[PDB]
Design a protein around this ligand. Structure first.
Ligand SMILES: [Cl-]
Ligand SMILES: [Cl-]
Ligand SMILES: [Cl-]
Ligand SMILES: [Cl-]
Ligand SMILES: [Cl-]
Ligand SMILES: [Cl-]
Ligand SMILES: [Cl-]
Ligand SMILES: [Mg+2]
Ligand SMILES: [Mg+2]
Ligand SMILES: [Mg+2]
Ligand SMILES: [Mg+2]
Ligand SMILES: [Mg+2]
Ligand SMILES: [Mg+2]
Ligand SMILES: [Mg+2]
Ligand SMILES: [Mg+2]
Ligand SMILES: [Mg+2]
Ligand SMILES: [Mg+2]
Ligand SMILES: [Mg+2]
Ligand SMILES: [Mg+2]
Ligand SMILES: [Mg+2]
Ligand SMILES: [Mg+2]
Ligand SMILES: [Mg+2]
Ligand SMILES: [Mg+2]
Ligand code: NA
Ligand code: NA
Ligand code: NA
Ligand code: NA
Ligand code: NA
Ligand code: NA
Ligand code: NA
Ligand code: NA
Ligand code: NA
Ligand code: NA
Ligand code: NA
Ligand code: NA
Ligand code: NA
Ligand code: NA
Ligand code: NA
Ligand code: NA
Lengths: 142, 142, 49, 150
RNA sequence: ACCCUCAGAAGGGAGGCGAAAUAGAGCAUGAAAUCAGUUGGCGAUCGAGCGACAGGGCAUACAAGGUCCCUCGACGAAUGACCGACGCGCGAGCGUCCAGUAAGACUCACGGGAAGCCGAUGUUCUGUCGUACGUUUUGAAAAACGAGCCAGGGAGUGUGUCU
RNA sequence: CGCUCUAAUUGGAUGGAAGUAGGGGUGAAAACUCCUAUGGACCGAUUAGUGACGAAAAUCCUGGCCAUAGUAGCAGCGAUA
RNA sequence: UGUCCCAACGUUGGGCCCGGUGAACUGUACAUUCCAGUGCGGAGUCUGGAGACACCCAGGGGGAAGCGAAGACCCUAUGGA
């Protein structure tokens, strides 16, 4: 009578002490929006980041208050970079064969959006049986 | 009429500026202050030059305006305003929780703040706010 | 000759208009104009072997 | 053209629309604004008084150069848009007619929703001096009305 | 189609077809600028590159993020005391000891708590910094030049030869 | 990093593709991805190619649109009707 | 002899209010400003102060070095006629 997501939704990965620390750091430090200079002053200018090239640009000059400039110094920890917030490493899946080789303790799977309901159902049930969590599960009424 | 002053300061024979500096400090600390006997407050200096300064202020002005108070009343309050960021919320809040009065409309005798008192016995070059207001043309309503 | 088949001329300064060739009050020829020539288009002469 | 921008329960609701009316879109906003919440009947009397010139329509947004009117309350500028008013009376006549044919008491229904939309311009061209021409267009308005039982 | 309305082959209402009329005639999809109505936040005593980073109010269906708060305790870099004891200094105050101790960012463990609750998003308030952008220029916020706004279009290419 | 089309290898889609709107996650970032709604037929990935491949600007071009504004004009003429 | 001293009253058409019709110029953004200062030495936007409740109508045009025109003057170009 209520919606329930298929599979091991609550499953959590097991991470080394170091990795869990680095993951928690990433989440605590965060990073700036890094949106393009003045994107908010003109509608024709979008949020997508572009290097400020004006010789007098205030951002380019690094004037405090004008936003952070993209630099290598902002990179996230090597060990956690790219990890879903849950800590899992994602693996993109298009069919059942894509599930082969996936470590349910370490990786979680994300079914491509294009895959249809018919194929999802099969992927979702064999994923669960292989002990793999599906990040974008179908919600059935049970 | 009726002002729950946490503090009542007596200005009689006290150096206005010094008093004002303390009343601001307190008003920003959230204290409700009432300054009494403004007319009897005093400012050191050569009366003649002291007066020219205030008379100038009265004459300054134009269409936009430069409203300068003549009564010892206002004079003292404006002085306090100059020591507060009166255009900021916090500052206008403090300024508004401060009121100056001619004479003392309270029952309690106001207190004398440390280092604000002037020794008439050892000082001859100074003036009373009331004296200044009379010179400015104010109406001696005290 | 695509986009070059016209006698469009630019009026030059004087009317608060950019110096763009125009004909019948319609812009033409130049790359940035609609119906104008392709600046660096594909070329039959190119050796693609 | 428009579609009803608001959901309406058919059992306690009567609908109506004007299509591509060539009249002031600015006047229409004002009028809609003013009669919303009124009883279809009250609305009719009001608009007729407007047309008669005994009742001003507050012009709250498109008021530049408009002269004040004493009868306007809570505001100042106002006029007597008779053309747009007549078109609204047509709109109301239809709605109240539709409402009766359904068994409701038309006149007593409340104007739940009423809004004007600028669907287009009948373009026109006016010759000007120096060998040049400039636009001379007419607005085309659509307007929805939803009557609801009290 | 039929019926009501209407000056009415108009339009509108009701209804019919079709998977779909938000496929109803320049009718596939239906962006932005922008308009009507409406919801959230602000609002008729207050200041202007419209934001970045911090932190508060208010607002929030699900989904695709799940964290967050307080007691205590463990760990604990640089830094690092109060009080008290003694001894100096005209004095503000300092020295020795207590002690590299207590404290000390992050992280973790037990227990307890939140689900508009944490993140996030909308808006608004406070703090810090902040006079667009690009171009010209020794020097641009510039009273130097360009743009009303948005969408789409808009500029190192080919052959030969040489290196 | 992203765009077009070609080839090899290999996948998704009417049990709902592209696109669009709003929203969630990742990446320092170019950008990648997922959810819901809309849509109703196409769409990718890896490798090796391809090139009329990336815009905020040029008094840039073309189209659409807002303010201007219910404003100016619809009076002025020896023909005041 | 209203050119002037020195302006007045009046006449007609506008102007103002109402119905109908209904453009254009112009717009980086923000914008209730004033006095000073500062800055590429001529600032509504910087700095310090002062003033400042919001909206609207009519006016005469002080400022936006207002709008209109890639300065005709001057110089420069191994420019033109
Ligand atoms: Cl890197
Ligand atoms: Cl004044
Ligand atoms: Cl202030
Ligand atoms: Cl003395
Ligand atoms: Cl309009
Ligand atoms: Cl840590
Ligand atoms: Cl190049
Ligand atoms: Mg933008
Ligand atoms: Mg062409
Ligand atoms: Mg007017
Ligand atoms: Mg002619
Ligand atoms: Mg369509
Ligand atoms: Mg200021
Ligand atoms: Mg120079
Ligand atoms: Mg483009
Ligand atoms: Mg391959
Ligand atoms: Mg550029
Ligand atoms: Mg244009
Ligand atoms: Mg005007
Ligand atoms: Mg006559
Ligand atoms: Mg020139
Ligand atoms: Mg000459
Ligand atoms: Mg010659
Ligand atoms: Na003094
Ligand atoms: Na004054
Ligand atoms: Na031709
Ligand atoms: Na132009
Ligand atoms: Na060839
Ligand atoms: Na208005
Ligand atoms: Na009124
Ligand atoms: Na009234
Ligand atoms: Na907030
Ligand atoms: Na330039
Ligand atoms: Na600049
Ligand atoms: Na300047
Ligand atoms: Na324009
Ligand atoms: Na190109
Ligand atoms: Na005369
Ligand atoms: Na002026």
């Amino acid at each position: 009578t209520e919606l329930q997501a298929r599979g091991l939704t609550e499953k959590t990965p097991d991470l080394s002490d170091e990795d869990a620390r680095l993951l928690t750091q990433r989440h605590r430090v965060g990073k700036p929006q890094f949106n393009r200079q003045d994107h908010h002053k003109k509608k024709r200018v979008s949020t997508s980041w572009r290097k400020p090239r004006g010789q007098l640009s205030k951002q380019r000059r690094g004037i405090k208050g004008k936003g952070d400039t993209v630099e290598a110094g902002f990179r996230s920890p090597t060990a956690v970079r790219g990890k879903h917030p849950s800590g899992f490493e994602e693996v993109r899946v298009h069919n059942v064969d894509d599930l082969e080789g996936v470590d349910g303790d370490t990786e979680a799977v994300r079914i491509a959006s294009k895959v249809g309901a018919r194929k999802r159902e099969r992927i979702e049930e064999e994923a669960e049986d292989a002990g793999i969590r599906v990040l974008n599960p179908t919600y059935v009424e049970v | 009429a009726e002002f729950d002053a946490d503090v009542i300061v007596d200005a009689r024979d006290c150096i206005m500026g010094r008093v004002a500096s303390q009343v601001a400090e307190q008003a920003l600390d959230g204290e409700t202050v009432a300054v009494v006997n403004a007319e009897r407050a005093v400012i050191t200096g050569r009366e003649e030059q002291i007066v020219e300064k205030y008379e100038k202020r009265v004459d300054i002005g134009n269409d936009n305006g430069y409203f300068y108070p003549k009564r010892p009343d206002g004079i003292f309050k404006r002085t306090i305003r100059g020591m507060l960021p009166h255009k900021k919320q916090r500052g206008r809040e403090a300024f508004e929780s401060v009121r100056v009065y001619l004479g003392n409309p309270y029952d309690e005798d106001g207190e004398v703040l440390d280092g604000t008192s002037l020794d008439r016995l050892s000082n001859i070059k100074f003036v009373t706010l009331g004296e200044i207001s009379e010179t400015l043309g104010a109406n001696k309503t005290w | 000759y695509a986009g070059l088949r016209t006698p469009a001329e630019s009026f030059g300064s004087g009317r608060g208009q950019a110096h763009v060739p125009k004909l019948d009050g319609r812009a033409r020829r130049v790359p940035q104009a609609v119906k104008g020539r392709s600046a660096h288009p594909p070329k039959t002469e190119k050796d693609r072997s | 053209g428009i579609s009803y921008s608001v959901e309406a329960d058919p059992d306690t609701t009567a609908k109506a629309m004007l299509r591509e009316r060539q009249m002031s879109f600015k006047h229409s906003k004002a009028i809609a604004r003013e009669i919303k919440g009124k009883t279809a009947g009250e609305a009719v009397d009001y608009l007729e008084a407007v047309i008669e010139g005994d009742q001003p329509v507050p012009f709250k947004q498109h008021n530049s150069g408009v002269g004040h009117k004493s009868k306007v309350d809570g505001w100042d500028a106002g006029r007597y848009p008779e053309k747009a008013s007549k078109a609204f009376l047509d709109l109301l006549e239809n709605a109240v007619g539709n409402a009766d044919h359904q068994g409701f008491d038309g006149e007593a229904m409340t104007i739940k929703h009423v809004a004007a939309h600028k669907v287009g311009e009948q373009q026109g061209r006016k010759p000007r001096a120096m060998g040049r021409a400039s636009a001379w267009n007419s607005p085309q308005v659509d307007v929805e009305l939803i009557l609801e039982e009290p």
